[PDB]
Amino acid sequence: GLEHMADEEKLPPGWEKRMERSSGRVYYFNHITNASQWERPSG
Numbered sequence: 001g002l003e004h005m006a007d008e009e010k011l012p013p014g015w016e017k018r019m020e021r022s023s024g025r026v027y028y029f030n031h032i033t034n035a036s037q038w039e040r041p042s043g
Contacts, residue, residue, distance in 0.1 A: 007040070008040055011028060011041065012041055012042055012043030013032075014030045014033070015028050015029065015030050015043065016029050016030075016031060017029075028041050
């Protein structure tokens with residue numbers, strides 16, 4: 001809460017914005033192809 005609503009918050013279809021439990025680092029994960037990236041993806 002108390003943030004902005006950039007397009008960074010509404011990931012494309014198949015992608016999900018999650019955080020790593022190991023270091024606590026936010027990233028994106030594509031459940032369609034079991035991929036992931038840090039840069040904003042595009043469906």
